[PDB]
């Protein structure tokens with residue numbers, strides 16, 4: 680791909696984080712803590728899952744960023760509406776305002792309803808995310824495999840401002856403690 684020139688500097692919004700998350704001082708890394716992180720509750724925090732939003736809001740144009748997923752067993756990545764549900768149980772789908780992919784139990788899937796099997800020969804260590812607001816496109820790229828396409832959501836109906844979306848996943852296995860990291864430009 681040739682989307683790298685739309686690179687944007689994403690930072691994580693502490694106020695939206697699940698209360699177990701630990702966000703680095705530079706707001707560029709997030710991981711699952713082993714306990715509640717001693718923060719107050721608020722209506723923005725994702726309550727049921729280890730999720731957090733980027734601070735940036737996008738309503739036009741083309742945007743690109745990269746995320747490091749090295750040695751994780753489970754995670755979700757993509758974008759979502761600013762107005763997504765924060766409390767209780769929900770599925771990741773475009774109907775619920777999410778455009779995402781994930782790793783779970785050794786398979787990669789796109790967050791359609793129902794979910795779509797992805798075909799990845801080279802397990803990625805870094806993921807590129809491209810959003811074209813006007814075109815209604817969200818695309819995912821395998822940076823480990825020379826930028827190869829993973830998945831494109833087209834005919835997207837954003838229906839609001841978009842925020843970068845992250846899920847570090849649970850760590851029931853003891854093998855998923857590693858952080859998500861926003862990679863430098």
Ligand SMILES: O=C(N1CCOCC1)N1CCC=C(F)C1
Nearest residue numbers: 697699726727728729730849850
């Ligand atoms: O219930 C948990 N868990 C963490 C410990 O392991 C069990 C699952 N929480 C609270 C709700 C959302 C979270 F991210 C963390």
